[model samples]
Target: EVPLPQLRAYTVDASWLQPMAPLQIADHTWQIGTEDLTALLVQTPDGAVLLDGGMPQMASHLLDNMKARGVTPRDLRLILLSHAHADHAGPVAELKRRTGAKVAANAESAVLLARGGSDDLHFGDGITYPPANADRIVMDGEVITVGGIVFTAHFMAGHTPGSTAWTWTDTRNGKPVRIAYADSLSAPGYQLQGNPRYPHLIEDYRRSFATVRALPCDVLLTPHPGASNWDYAAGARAGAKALTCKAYADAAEQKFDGQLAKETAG
Candidate 1:
């Protein structure tokens, strides 16, 4: 584990990725946007791992995003879909055709991915995502390494029955390699409400929380910006840990049901 440094933010055009431009979030890390959703790209010692494929509407943006980042389609070795939502995993097939990256995802995600389009969907709450399929299957405690960055995949079935959490390490500011994560919503107060029953899966959510808190990350990156940022170097590390929802026991005990969904969002 090397000492970590801050990777200053650099604003890149939303057009850079063509339809789905990418902005530098950290060294070796680019957050590519497709419509209302975003995907994560990390350059590892081996090749590259793309987490999520953005939305169908922003299909072209993905290619542009990678090009501007100096990443060619051949460089993308793997695509890990967080879940089956179109906003998150919509472009699996097209991305595979372009980047030649293998789609790695859990069963539910694979089911949606295989369907190829967004016509099929199931949801009882908030908004529903169209479905798609994956090229490979993902499971809990699975580790995939690329470019020397190790990403441990954990099956967290809360937001959806097949939601996932990914943890990895990257060199920030092109300096120290630090730990990081994606997939788990890190909105402030951990408040959210897309999964409908997002309020009911407190136990599963807690387990997911514990998994991330155990990591040795110097920085934390969630998909959305304007959300809470975790600074590992600062004394603010504690709050970052709470992104795992570990320290929220008191909060949970007091208002465990849907308080998180309420306060975190409002």
Candidate 2:
């Protein structure tokens, strides 16, 4: 196969696609996404597991970034998702096809995946992406082991019916470090009150906040790094206390509460 870089080329500027080299945010995780989006790669003895897909247009870029880090299609064992949003789950179908990695998601998300990002309670069919079917349907609190690495899935269904958070422990500085890949906690253009489509709109979001706050987190990496105010340089430090999962949840909760109040009143 010809080098992907040569096949297609574009002049990348400091735009939403602001160019940033893939970063090793932690001992075992690498950020294989653009500054606008974040896709994490967790290394293992057998292969690698990609936690999120950036966008429909990010397929080739992600693969290229993976190669830059010395990981190949043969080394990709799983293509996973945090939700079926256009930005997050958009590239899963392509990535899964190219890498031959098994695709997995929560049962709720699996249904949305089949529909290709249509019919979401928040946005309906207005936001959609290429449909992808899961090879394995993961359950909440289930352990997904790959190459001796263990990652757990937790359902945080407020953002979407299939919104999920992943947690795993990694070794750094000769000790175990708790890491969390928490799902988005913001209510960006969401209907927080009295939505006929989703039965527990506000309730689910409230519960999700608690779940995120209770995560086992020492260093937190979110789908959108900026969402958590995560500094790439600070994250790579020996020990980062500012980037805790509870802080992320607590901060997000304040804004969420404000939105809920506004939606509830004038």
Candidate 3:
């Protein structure tokens, strides 16, 4: 097989898809619906907070997953976006209209989201989605407390100008488990050495790596389930012991460097 760098450009056909059912990881934490993408649902005393909403095509399945978990769509009190990527925030507008839950996102992401994704820099031709507004703007190191549960947002802007990683704590079998939902550390078509949109892209990645290293990740979650190398099943440990921010950051950095070097050489 040819190396990825040998390809002129890479695009995966959307047809190759297999859906996975919602899988509970902790007592009150579950990874919810979408065939290719997944979102996290955290239950609390007041209601529940959804981490991301998958593509619009899978919105119904997302609702179905919630129902299977004994959670109604109305049970969601808030939706936190990891980034404004289409797969991550696509269903958010529809969900907000249906559930009346507040939407919170990084201030920079709020701008693009409000415009229905008009200014998304990652997709060269640009991708659009239904417009959605943020009821609350999350800043770096900001702590959002809901129903006695706390979710702290961290800024790591390499993937997008407002990419955010969320860290929270939950109890599992009476043991405190620290969970971190890290934003994508690298973009599919981003240039590590020189990016037009972000001239200081390398610096942004450096800081992002440092931020991830500092997170207390007992359980590391990614926007994509498979990226974490953990089985998303109820009876499984979910590879909790295998979670590490350094591993992800280091590997992503190496990939970025390698890809950019190849492009430059060519």
Candidate 4:
């Protein structure tokens, strides 16, 4: 539900990189990252599960932010990724090294991670990071439970080979609150008409749009705060239908279609 202007501004490098404070989203879930990049954390009785590492340079900032929220390095038991892009997977290696936590990501993203950010269909070495691998490969409809927190991985691969969206439900106000950490759907400078490296790019984006629409996402979170119309003070929206998945899906689809038409203009 990010405003179209905000989404466009981010791609143009007008990103909101201001320091963000850790704020509760649900009961035990908190978002501790920057204004644009998201580093979502879920606390369980056994420990904590962190998602997305932001940029490489933002590593220390994320760690310090976590500490301010009373979460220690050893408390992080698992790290999950929305994708293997530099902005999201940048600090994963460092985070894993410090926490000794298991890493998980979509199968395609796992391969990209092993490559250390090279060999991307679109980016193609435009950005690189410290090579890393996923301890576990996630698939569509895969359910991973760690410390009583069950995360369902929805493979939303279009923006990248394995742009994954995760979902989990927690009790809030005596009702089951389903929150979704949806990945970015921006095409930015992508080849939509006929991508040489990623021939299936259009098909993947279309499929992912449907996946985003069908999810039972009462609350929506995105890698970029503006991507979800996120309220920084309140964190992720907590109420049911606060942000619907269909709206997000529709917006992305429209943008993609518009971009495709532009690419096809001859």
Candidate 5:
């Protein structure tokens, strides 16, 4: 039986078709969409930026979730893709069209987005989609700033050739907030099991794992929950702390494979 702590944040869909919140996984940050594939929205002094749009079906619901949190389509300035995977990035074109938001994705992914091919980047038997036209090609260590919040991109390519993660700081309630938007931690084993194979560009999944483990992350965010036990606000505080403690490191490791592993070690 799953203990209370494990069940605390994870709400399983009985038929594996239940809907989840665009949960506020971190302070001022929410993970949007179904448990399988999702998006991250980070709010800042300048404005809000979305990290990977989920499935097209969730667009309206996603928008509603944002509105419920005080953000609107007009407020979205940029949409960053973690990789060119369909489920992870399929909604880009629609969201861009709706919000007129700019896109920043990896160079290779930019090409995929340009060609608009139907090839799923993951090749796994999941809901793979295609890419869209990206406005900018995200380079390693690149910094994307909106308003006063700054997001630093890191190439943690293992899940895909262009797979990347973002680190940024936000000011909330007049306090500095720190976070690492880890788009593809392969959270929730089902995603990995559904598509056991990774992208051709994933140079080193283990190495990428180590890189993220060493990074200065306040809150290590997975694409979805059941990825780990994260006190969303606590994760946000990790981003703000002067010292990245063992707890943060532990959370970072947990993100690699914690809950889902025990339940379904894919």
Candidate 6:
């Protein structure tokens, strides 16, 4: 039997499907993706900017969500990726072909995506997605502004070699609010100690925690809804659980320590 905590962590709650609607987190920013995956839509003067595209199977869900919000695929201007995982970037090629939107990714992820997403362990080795090249290869701290929305890329390696956490500024009411798209900090099936796949895995995770702790997270958006403490929608609460960004990094640190301890015991 699956542990309660583990089940909650990996599986999506049934509540997500009951009310299929867009989640407005900020003034012009909205989250229209599903429970387990994320695809944040930021409205700009030109068109729209999408943060991530879920798995290939979830492409229809993405389109339906967009259509429900009166946004067509042709209205997309940019598709900025969080990572090269199939669950995060599987629909890139198809969406790009349909929308003509420029794809942007970090150098490491870009290279892997160009090679048909072979770096993703969950859906690599035997299966691969269509090879798509990033029109813009962004570096750490590089600010990408499409229309009026600006996103600053921060490298937080752990889940992947090029795992990125984006920090963007948005207005809540009349005050400037800082929003952070926190990357997956958990190790999951990977090893944090001595791993040949990622020689600096432990160090990378350590640096990521420090980086995440220092980030300005007035609003935190995670890939998985279960990773966070609360949920958001058009009318629901914005869900500001902790006052500071330290809570998120601290939680990740605790999970990492637990995993390390388990590994040590065995």
**Candidate 3 deviant stretches above 4 angstroms:** 1-17, 233-242
lDDT of 3 at 184: 83
Give candidate 2's error at residue 218 in angstroms: 0.6
Question: Of models 2 and 6, which has the larger lDDT?
Answer: 2
Instruction: List, residue by residue over 1-266, the lDDT tens digit for candidate 4.
Output: 77565222113153445667887777778878776778888988888889987887677888888788777988888889888888888888888888767898877889998887888887677777888878988778999997777999999988887898999997778788888988988888887766788888889999999999998788888887767677564545433334578888899999888888888884
The TM-score of candidate 6 is: 0.86
Q: What is the TM-score of each candidate against the true structure?
A: 0.67, 0.89, 0.88, 0.89, 0.68, 0.86
In the range 104-215, model 1's lDDT, one tens digit per residue, is 7778667655654333323322223344446668678888778777788767555455677677776655577554544543322443445343554656656655654555
At residue 238, what lDDT does model 3 achieve?
58
- The 10-residue segment of model 5 with minimum total lDDT is 7-16
Report the C-alpha lDDT of model 2 over 1-266, residue by residue, as the tens digit. Answer: 67555322222334335545778766778887777577888888789999888777788988998888888998998977888788778888888889968888888889998888888887776667788888998999999998767899988988788899998888878788788888898878888777788878778878898999999987788877777776544446423444577888888889988987888785
lDDT of 5 by residue, 1-266 (tens): 87564223223344222345656644567765555455677776667888876554556666776677677888888988766655557677777777858998778678766655345354432443444687887778888888766778887765565667788875556666677766454533334333344533223555566667766666565554334343233344422333232343355446655543664632
Candidate 4 displacement at residue 169 in angstroms? 0.5
Better of 2 and 4 by lDDT: 4
Clashing residue pair totals per candidate (backbone < 3 A) = 15, 0, 0, 0, 6, 0
Error of 4 at 133 (Å): 1.7
Q: Write the per-residue lDDT of candidate 3 for residues 1-266, one digit (tens) a residue.
A: 77575423223235213456777767778888543465888888789889988665566777777778777877989999888877678888888877757898888889878877776665652567788999998889999887777999999988888889899998899999888998888757666566677888878878898898788888888877656665554236656545587787787778777777876886
Which 10-residue window of candidate 3 scores lowest in summed lDDT?
A: 7-16
lDDT of each: 0.58, 0.80, 0.77, 0.81, 0.61, 0.76
**Candidate 4 — which residues are off by over 4 angstroms?**
1-16, 233-242
- Candidate 4: worst-modelled 10 consecutive residues by lDDT: 6-15
True-vs-predicted CA distance for residue 178, candidate 2, Å: 0.9
lDDT of 6 by residue, 1-266 (tens): 77565212223345443334678888878887765566788887678888887666566777777777777878887888777776677788888887758988888888877876765643344436677889998989999887767889999988878889888898888889898887778887666677767788888899999998988788777776556654554246546552345887898989998999988887
- In Å, residue 123's CA in model 6 sits off its true spot by 7.4
